[PDB]
Amino acid sequence: DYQQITDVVIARGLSQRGVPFSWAGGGISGPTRGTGTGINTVGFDASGLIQYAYAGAGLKLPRSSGQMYKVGQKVLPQQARKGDLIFYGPEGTQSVALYLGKGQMLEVGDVVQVSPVRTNGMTPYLVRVL
């Protein structure tokens, strides 16, 4: 069911903790070399990590956080549930992160990491994928 598939997606994302940030790096099958500053770093950008996680549900999310945000069903902050996507920037064009429950999210800083939910520039809706 949806809860078990969400658990698979979360476990997939979490398994990548410690993988480096790489500009334009990664995707549905795992981290890859990026472009620009990421050209010699096998890793993930924010979109890449989220694509990777959700490939556990057989889905191919859009590559850009902005298009992920546009296409996805919106839920309100007070309804946040593990597996929901948190966005940053206007219309979510800056970045995306995976809500884990309990006020934590999975994101890519300088490496893939769990963090408290960042508030600065948070987009007003979350997306519920499943």
Side-chain angles (χ1 to χ4, degrees), residues 12-46:
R12 273 179 73 91
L14 289 174
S15 76
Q16 302 303 293
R17 281 168 64 242
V19 171
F21 181 81
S22 184
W23 182 261
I28 62 168
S29 294
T32 70
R33 284 166 184 78
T35 70
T37 58
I39 192 62
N40 285 124
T41 310
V42 172
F44 284 113
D45 66 356

PDB file of all heavy atoms in Angstrom, residues 12-46:
ATOM      1  N   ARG A  12      15.197   4.560   0.713  1.00  0.00           N
ATOM      2  CA  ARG A  12      16.072   4.803  -0.449  1.00  0.00           C
ATOM      3  C   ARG A  12      16.809   6.125  -0.315  1.00  0.00           C
ATOM      4  O   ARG A  12      18.035   6.221  -0.511  1.00  0.00           O
ATOM      5  CB  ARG A  12      15.267   4.822  -1.748  1.00  0.00           C
ATOM      6  CG  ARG A  12      15.082   3.501  -2.341  1.00  0.00           C
ATOM      7  CD  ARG A  12      14.267   3.568  -3.611  1.00  0.00           C
ATOM      8  NE  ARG A  12      14.983   4.125  -4.758  1.00  0.00           N
ATOM      9  CZ  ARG A  12      15.684   3.416  -5.651  1.00  0.00           C
ATOM     10  NH1 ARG A  12      15.836   2.099  -5.520  1.00  0.00           N
ATOM     11  NH2 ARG A  12      16.269   4.010  -6.669  1.00  0.00           N
ATOM     12  N   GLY A  13      16.065   7.185  -0.019  1.00  0.00           N
ATOM     13  CA  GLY A  13      16.711   8.464   0.199  1.00  0.00           C
ATOM     14  C   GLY A  13      17.725   8.439   1.313  1.00  0.00           C
ATOM     15  O   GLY A  13      18.855   8.900   1.151  1.00  0.00           O
ATOM     16  N   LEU A  14      17.320   7.917   2.462  1.00  0.00           N
ATOM     17  CA  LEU A  14      18.217   7.896   3.616  1.00  0.00           C
ATOM     18  C   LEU A  14      19.504   7.113   3.365  1.00  0.00           C
ATOM     19  O   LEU A  14      20.542   7.433   3.963  1.00  0.00           O
ATOM     20  CB  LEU A  14      17.492   7.344   4.842  1.00  0.00           C
ATOM     21  CG  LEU A  14      16.413   8.193   5.488  1.00  0.00           C
ATOM     22  CD1 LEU A  14      15.697   7.397   6.634  1.00  0.00           C
ATOM     23  CD2 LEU A  14      16.892   9.502   5.964  1.00  0.00           C
ATOM     24  N   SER A  15      19.439   6.113   2.480  1.00  0.00           N
ATOM     25  CA  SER A  15      20.597   5.286   2.178  1.00  0.00           C
ATOM     26  C   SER A  15      21.702   6.074   1.530  1.00  0.00           C
ATOM     27  O   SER A  15      22.836   5.590   1.473  1.00  0.00           O
ATOM     28  CB  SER A  15      20.213   4.121   1.276  1.00  0.00           C
ATOM     29  OG  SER A  15      20.011   4.499  -0.080  1.00  0.00           O
ATOM     30  N   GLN A  16      21.377   7.253   1.021  1.00  0.00           N
ATOM     31  CA  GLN A  16      22.345   8.090   0.342  1.00  0.00           C
ATOM     32  C   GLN A  16      23.021   9.131   1.240  1.00  0.00           C
ATOM     33  O   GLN A  16      23.840   9.905   0.793  1.00  0.00           O
ATOM     34  CB  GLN A  16      21.707   8.765  -0.874  1.00  0.00           C
ATOM     35  CG  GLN A  16      21.117   7.790  -1.894  1.00  0.00           C
ATOM     36  CD  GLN A  16      22.146   6.801  -2.387  1.00  0.00           C
ATOM     37  OE1 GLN A  16      23.086   7.199  -3.063  1.00  0.00           O
ATOM     38  NE2 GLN A  16      22.033   5.544  -1.981  1.00  0.00           N
ATOM     39  N   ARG A  17      22.728   9.102   2.529  1.00  0.00           N
ATOM     40  CA  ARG A  17      23.383  10.007   3.467  1.00  0.00           C
ATOM     41  C   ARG A  17      24.889   9.899   3.343  1.00  0.00           C
ATOM     42  O   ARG A  17      25.405   8.790   3.292  1.00  0.00           O
ATOM     43  CB  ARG A  17      22.939   9.724   4.911  1.00  0.00           C
ATOM     44  CG  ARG A  17      21.553  10.324   5.220  1.00  0.00           C
ATOM     45  CD  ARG A  17      21.005   9.807   6.509  1.00  0.00           C
ATOM     46  NE  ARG A  17      21.775  10.156   7.711  1.00  0.00           N
ATOM     47  CZ  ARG A  17      22.358   9.280   8.528  1.00  0.00           C
ATOM     48  NH1 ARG A  17      22.323   7.970   8.275  1.00  0.00           N
ATOM     49  NH2 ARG A  17      22.937   9.717   9.651  1.00  0.00           N
ATOM     50  N   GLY A  18      25.572  11.036   3.267  1.00  0.00           N
ATOM     51  CA  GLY A  18      27.038  11.048   3.133  1.00  0.00           C
ATOM     52  C   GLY A  18      27.549  11.169   1.712  1.00  0.00           C
ATOM     53  O   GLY A  18      28.726  11.482   1.511  1.00  0.00           O
ATOM     54  N   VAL A  19      26.683  10.925   0.718  1.00  0.00           N
ATOM     55  CA  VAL A  19      27.059  11.149  -0.676  1.00  0.00           C
ATOM     56  C   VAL A  19      27.244  12.673  -0.933  1.00  0.00           C
ATOM     57  O   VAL A  19      26.439  13.458  -0.456  1.00  0.00           O
ATOM     58  CB  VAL A  19      25.980  10.565  -1.626  1.00  0.00           C
ATOM     59  CG1 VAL A  19      26.227  10.978  -3.071  1.00  0.00           C
ATOM     60  CG2 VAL A  19      25.917   9.026  -1.484  1.00  0.00           C
ATOM     61  N   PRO A  20      28.287  13.081  -1.664  1.00  0.00           N
ATOM     62  CA  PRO A  20      28.516  14.513  -1.853  1.00  0.00           C
ATOM     63  C   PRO A  20      27.460  15.239  -2.679  1.00  0.00           C
ATOM     64  O   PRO A  20      26.806  14.634  -3.527  1.00  0.00           O
ATOM     65  CB  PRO A  20      29.859  14.598  -2.586  1.00  0.00           C
ATOM     66  CG  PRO A  20      30.343  13.220  -2.732  1.00  0.00           C
ATOM     67  CD  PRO A  20      29.340  12.251  -2.274  1.00  0.00           C
ATOM     68  N   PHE A  21      27.318  16.528  -2.428  1.00  0.00           N
ATOM     69  CA  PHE A  21      26.669  17.407  -3.375  1.00  0.00           C
ATOM     70  C   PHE A  21      27.453  17.456  -4.675  1.00  0.00           C
ATOM     71  O   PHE A  21      28.674  17.580  -4.669  1.00  0.00           O
ATOM     72  CB  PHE A  21      26.547  18.823  -2.818  1.00  0.00           C
ATOM     73  CG  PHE A  21      25.844  19.778  -3.753  1.00  0.00           C
ATOM     74  CD1 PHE A  21      24.487  19.797  -3.824  1.00  0.00           C
ATOM     75  CD2 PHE A  21      26.562  20.586  -4.639  1.00  0.00           C
ATOM     76  CE1 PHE A  21      23.829  20.661  -4.688  1.00  0.00           C
ATOM     77  CE2 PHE A  21      25.901  21.451  -5.516  1.00  0.00           C
ATOM     78  CZ  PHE A  21      24.543  21.473  -5.543  1.00  0.00           C
ATOM     79  N   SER A  22      26.737  17.428  -5.785  1.00  0.00           N
ATOM     80  CA  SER A  22      27.320  17.627  -7.084  1.00  0.00           C
ATOM     81  C   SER A  22      26.309  18.400  -7.919  1.00  0.00           C
ATOM     82  O   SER A  22      25.181  17.907  -8.118  1.00  0.00           O
ATOM     83  CB  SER A  22      27.652  16.289  -7.744  1.00  0.00           C
ATOM     84  OG  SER A  22      28.304  16.512  -8.963  1.00  0.00           O
ATOM     85  N   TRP A  23      26.702  19.579  -8.412  1.00  0.00           N
ATOM     86  CA  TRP A  23      25.823  20.415  -9.251  1.00  0.00           C
ATOM     87  C   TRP A  23      25.306  19.606 -10.435  1.00  0.00           C
ATOM     88  O   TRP A  23      26.094  19.034 -11.169  1.00  0.00           O
ATOM     89  CB  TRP A  23      26.526  21.675  -9.791  1.00  0.00           C
ATOM     90  CG  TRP A  23      25.579  22.494 -10.590  1.00  0.00           C
ATOM     91  CD1 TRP A  23      25.467  22.516 -11.939  1.00  0.00           C
ATOM     92  CD2 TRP A  23      24.538  23.367 -10.081  1.00  0.00           C
ATOM     93  NE1 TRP A  23      24.411  23.325 -12.328  1.00  0.00           N
ATOM     94  CE2 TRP A  23      23.802  23.832 -11.206  1.00  0.00           C
ATOM     95  CE3 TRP A  23      24.127  23.742  -8.803  1.00  0.00           C
ATOM     96  CZ2 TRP A  23      22.719  24.707 -11.077  1.00  0.00           C
ATOM     97  CZ3 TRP A  23      23.022  24.610  -8.676  1.00  0.00           C
ATOM     98  CH2 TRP A  23      22.355  25.095  -9.812  1.00  0.00           C
ATOM     99  N   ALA A  24      23.977  19.555 -10.600  1.00  0.00           N
ATOM    100  CA  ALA A  24      23.333  18.778 -11.661  1.00  0.00           C
ATOM    101  C   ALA A  24      23.639  17.277 -11.629  1.00  0.00           C
ATOM    102  O   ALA A  24      23.487  16.597 -12.645  1.00  0.00           O
ATOM    103  CB  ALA A  24      23.645  19.385 -13.059  1.00  0.00           C
ATOM    104  N   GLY A  25      24.028  16.751 -10.459  1.00  0.00           N
ATOM    105  CA  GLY A  25      24.387  15.363 -10.347  1.00  0.00           C
ATOM    106  C   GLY A  25      23.270  14.440  -9.926  1.00  0.00           C
ATOM    107  O   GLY A  25      22.333  14.842  -9.224  1.00  0.00           O
ATOM    108  N   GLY A  26      23.354  13.185 -10.375  1.00  0.00           N
ATOM    109  CA  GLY A  26      22.468  12.157  -9.888  1.00  0.00           C
ATOM    110  C   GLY A  26      21.127  12.096 -10.580  1.00  0.00           C
ATOM    111  O   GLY A  26      20.782  12.942 -11.420  1.00  0.00           O
ATOM    112  N   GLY A  27      20.362  11.111 -10.183  1.00  0.00           N
ATOM    113  CA  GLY A  27      19.099  10.832 -10.783  1.00  0.00           C
ATOM    114  C   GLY A  27      18.532   9.531 -10.307  1.00  0.00           C
ATOM    115  O   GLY A  27      18.956   9.008  -9.260  1.00  0.00           O
ATOM    116  N   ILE A  28      17.638   8.966 -11.121  1.00  0.00           N
ATOM    117  CA  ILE A  28      16.826   7.820 -10.668  1.00  0.00           C
ATOM    118  C   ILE A  28      17.621   6.566 -10.312  1.00  0.00           C
ATOM    119  O   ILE A  28      17.139   5.769  -9.481  1.00  0.00           O
ATOM    120  CB  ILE A  28      15.660   7.445 -11.653  1.00  0.00           C
ATOM    121  CG1 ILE A  28      16.199   7.025 -13.021  1.00  0.00           C
ATOM    122  CG2 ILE A  28      14.683   8.629 -11.777  1.00  0.00           C
ATOM    123  CD1 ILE A  28      15.186   6.391 -13.907  1.00  0.00           C
ATOM    124  N   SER A  29      18.816   6.377 -10.888  1.00  0.00           N
ATOM    125  CA  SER A  29      19.559   5.150 -10.601  1.00  0.00           C
ATOM    126  C   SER A  29      20.684   5.331  -9.587  1.00  0.00           C
ATOM    127  O   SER A  29      21.394   4.363  -9.240  1.00  0.00           O
ATOM    128  CB  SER A  29      20.050   4.513 -11.881  1.00  0.00           C
ATOM    129  OG  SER A  29      18.935   4.082 -12.643  1.00  0.00           O
ATOM    130  N   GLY A  30      20.829   6.555  -9.088  1.00  0.00           N
ATOM    131  CA  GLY A  30      21.840   6.881  -8.109  1.00  0.00           C
ATOM    132  C   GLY A  30      22.648   8.131  -8.414  1.00  0.00           C
ATOM    133  O   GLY A  30      22.351   8.875  -9.355  1.00  0.00           O
ATOM    134  N   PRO A  31      23.674   8.398  -7.598  1.00  0.00           N
ATOM    135  CA  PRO A  31      24.467   9.598  -7.847  1.00  0.00           C
ATOM    136  C   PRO A  31      25.307   9.466  -9.113  1.00  0.00           C
ATOM    137  O   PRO A  31      25.667   8.345  -9.508  1.00  0.00           O
ATOM    138  CB  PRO A  31      25.386   9.672  -6.620  1.00  0.00           C
ATOM    139  CG  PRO A  31      25.523   8.236  -6.196  1.00  0.00           C
ATOM    140  CD  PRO A  31      24.203   7.588  -6.477  1.00  0.00           C
ATOM    141  N   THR A  32      25.597  10.596  -9.742  1.00  0.00           N
ATOM    142  CA  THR A  32      26.446  10.641 -10.934  1.00  0.00           C
ATOM    143  C   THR A  32      27.291  11.861 -10.911  1.00  0.00           C
ATOM    144  O   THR A  32      27.051  12.794 -10.161  1.00  0.00           O
ATOM    145  CB  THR A  32      25.639  10.663 -12.243  1.00  0.00           C
ATOM    146  OG1 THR A  32      24.967  11.909 -12.392  1.00  0.00           O
ATOM    147  CG2 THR A  32      24.618   9.531 -12.312  1.00  0.00           C
ATOM    148  N   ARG A  33      28.273  11.914 -11.796  1.00  0.00           N
ATOM    149  CA  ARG A  33      28.984  13.142 -11.999  1.00  0.00           C
ATOM    150  C   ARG A  33      28.014  14.223 -12.443  1.00  0.00           C
ATOM    151  O   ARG A  33      27.050  13.954 -13.160  1.00  0.00           O
ATOM    152  CB  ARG A  33      30.092  12.970 -13.036  1.00  0.00           C
ATOM    153  CG  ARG A  33      31.320  12.248 -12.527  1.00  0.00           C
ATOM    154  CD  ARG A  33      32.253  11.788 -13.640  1.00  0.00           C
ATOM    155  NE  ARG A  33      33.360  11.009 -13.059  1.00  0.00           N
ATOM    156  CZ  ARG A  33      33.293   9.729 -12.656  1.00  0.00           C
ATOM    157  NH1 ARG A  33      32.157   9.017 -12.762  1.00  0.00           N
ATOM    158  NH2 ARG A  33      34.379   9.146 -12.127  1.00  0.00           N
ATOM    159  N   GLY A  34      28.271  15.437 -11.977  1.00  0.00           N
ATOM    160  CA  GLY A  34      27.468  16.586 -12.310  1.00  0.00           C
ATOM    161  C   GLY A  34      28.080  17.397 -13.434  1.00  0.00           C
ATOM    162  O   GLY A  34      28.861  16.883 -14.240  1.00  0.00           O
ATOM    163  N   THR A  35      27.729  18.683 -13.483  1.00  0.00           N
ATOM    164  CA  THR A  35      28.288  19.606 -14.472  1.00  0.00           C
ATOM    165  C   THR A  35      28.875  20.769 -13.716  1.00  0.00           C
ATOM    166  O   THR A  35      28.637  20.933 -12.513  1.00  0.00           O
ATOM    167  CB  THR A  35      27.203  20.093 -15.467  1.00  0.00           C
ATOM    168  OG1 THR A  35      26.266  20.982 -14.827  1.00  0.00           O
ATOM    169  CG2 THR A  35      26.463  18.878 -16.103  1.00  0.00           C
ATOM    170  N   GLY A  36      29.665  21.579 -14.415  1.00  0.00           N
ATOM    171  CA  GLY A  36      30.196  22.775 -13.800  1.00  0.00           C
ATOM    172  C   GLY A  36      31.111  22.366 -12.655  1.00  0.00           C
ATOM    173  O   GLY A  36      31.996  21.495 -12.808  1.00  0.00           O
ATOM    174  N   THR A  37      30.852  22.920 -11.476  1.00  0.00           N
ATOM    175  CA  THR A  37      31.642  22.566 -10.297  1.00  0.00           C
ATOM    176  C   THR A  37      31.534  21.073  -9.903  1.00  0.00           C
ATOM    177  O   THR A  37      32.400  20.553  -9.176  1.00  0.00           O
ATOM    178  CB  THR A  37      31.211  23.392  -9.075  1.00  0.00           C
ATOM    179  OG1 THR A  37      29.826  23.189  -8.815  1.00  0.00           O
ATOM    180  CG2 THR A  37      31.457  24.895  -9.284  1.00  0.00           C
ATOM    181  N   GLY A  38      30.502  20.380 -10.386  1.00  0.00           N
ATOM    182  CA  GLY A  38      30.284  18.961 -10.080  1.00  0.00           C
ATOM    183  C   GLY A  38      30.851  17.961 -11.064  1.00  0.00           C
ATOM    184  O   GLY A  38      30.661  16.766 -10.910  1.00  0.00           O
ATOM    185  N   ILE A  39      31.576  18.435 -12.056  1.00  0.00           N
ATOM    186  CA  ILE A  39      32.041  17.589 -13.151  1.00  0.00           C
ATOM    187  C   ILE A  39      32.891  16.384 -12.723  1.00  0.00           C
ATOM    188  O   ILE A  39      32.842  15.347 -13.385  1.00  0.00           O
ATOM    189  CB  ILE A  39      32.806  18.441 -14.228  1.00  0.00           C
ATOM    190  CG1 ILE A  39      33.039  17.625 -15.514  1.00  0.00           C
ATOM    191  CG2 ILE A  39      34.138  18.981 -13.674  1.00  0.00           C
ATOM    192  CD1 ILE A  39      31.749  17.163 -16.247  1.00  0.00           C
ATOM    193  N   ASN A  40      33.661  16.530 -11.635  1.00  0.00           N
ATOM    194  CA  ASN A  40      34.477  15.422 -11.134  1.00  0.00           C
ATOM    195  C   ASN A  40      33.979  14.858  -9.790  1.00  0.00           C
ATOM    196  O   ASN A  40      34.707  14.138  -9.103  1.00  0.00           O
ATOM    197  CB  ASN A  40      35.953  15.844 -11.088  1.00  0.00           C
ATOM    198  CG  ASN A  40      36.587  15.888 -12.485  1.00  0.00           C
ATOM    199  OD1 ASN A  40      37.140  16.914 -12.915  1.00  0.00           O
ATOM    200  ND2 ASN A  40      36.502  14.776 -13.202  1.00  0.00           N
ATOM    201  N   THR A  41      32.733  15.142  -9.435  1.00  0.00           N
ATOM    202  CA  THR A  41      32.138  14.633  -8.213  1.00  0.00           C
ATOM    203  C   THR A  41      30.918  13.774  -8.503  1.00  0.00           C
ATOM    204  O   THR A  41      29.934  14.280  -8.993  1.00  0.00           O
ATOM    205  CB  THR A  41      31.693  15.777  -7.287  1.00  0.00           C
ATOM    206  OG1 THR A  41      32.758  16.724  -7.128  1.00  0.00           O
ATOM    207  CG2 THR A  41      31.297  15.255  -5.920  1.00  0.00           C
ATOM    208  N   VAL A  42      30.997  12.477  -8.208  1.00  0.00           N
ATOM    209  CA  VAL A  42      29.833  11.612  -8.238  1.00  0.00           C
ATOM    210  C   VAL A  42      28.978  11.982  -7.042  1.00  0.00           C
ATOM    211  O   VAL A  42      29.379  11.795  -5.879  1.00  0.00           O
ATOM    212  CB  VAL A  42      30.236  10.131  -8.193  1.00  0.00           C
ATOM    213  CG1 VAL A  42      29.018   9.216  -8.026  1.00  0.00           C
ATOM    214  CG2 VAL A  42      30.984   9.791  -9.450  1.00  0.00           C
ATOM    215  N   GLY A  43      27.796  12.518  -7.309  1.00  0.00           N
ATOM    216  CA  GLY A  43      26.923  12.876  -6.212  1.00  0.00           C
ATOM    217  C   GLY A  43      25.512  13.227  -6.645  1.00  0.00           C
ATOM    218  O   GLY A  43      25.045  12.791  -7.678  1.00  0.00           O
ATOM    219  N   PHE A  44      24.868  14.042  -5.832  1.00  0.00           N
ATOM    220  CA  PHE A  44      23.470  14.474  -6.061  1.00  0.00           C
ATOM    221  C   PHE A  44      23.320  15.963  -5.902  1.00  0.00           C
ATOM    222  O   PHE A  44      23.961  16.580  -5.042  1.00  0.00           O
ATOM    223  CB  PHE A  44      22.516  13.860  -4.989  1.00  0.00           C
ATOM    224  CG  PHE A  44      22.190  12.409  -5.193  1.00  0.00           C
ATOM    225  CD1 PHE A  44      22.639  11.452  -4.297  1.00  0.00           C
ATOM    226  CD2 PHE A  44      21.354  11.992  -6.231  1.00  0.00           C
ATOM    227  CE1 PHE A  44      22.307  10.122  -4.450  1.00  0.00           C
ATOM    228  CE2 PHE A  44      21.033  10.663  -6.386  1.00  0.00           C
ATOM    229  CZ  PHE A  44      21.500   9.712  -5.476  1.00  0.00           C
ATOM    230  N   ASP A  45      22.409  16.535  -6.696  1.00  0.00           N
ATOM    231  CA  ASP A  45      21.792  17.788  -6.319  1.00  0.00           C
ATOM    232  C   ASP A  45      20.444  17.478  -5.668  1.00  0.00           C
ATOM    233  O   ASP A  45      20.066  16.319  -5.532  1.00  0.00           O
ATOM    234  CB  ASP A  45      21.704  18.781  -7.482  1.00  0.00           C
ATOM    235  CG  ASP A  45      20.793  18.347  -8.607  1.00  0.00           C
ATOM    236  OD1 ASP A  45      20.251  17.226  -8.569  1.00  0.00           O
ATOM    237  OD2 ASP A  45      20.625  19.159  -9.575  1.00  0.00           O
ATOM    238  N   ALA A  46      19.723  18.516  -5.245  1.00  0.00           N
ATOM    239  CA  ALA A  46      18.485  18.304  -4.491  1.00  0.00           C
ATOM    240  C   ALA A  46      17.460  17.501  -5.294  1.00  0.00           C
ATOM    241  O   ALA A  46      16.898  16.526  -4.814  1.00  0.00           O
ATOM    242  CB  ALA A  46      17.896  19.639  -4.112  1.00  0.00           C
TER     243      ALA A  46
END
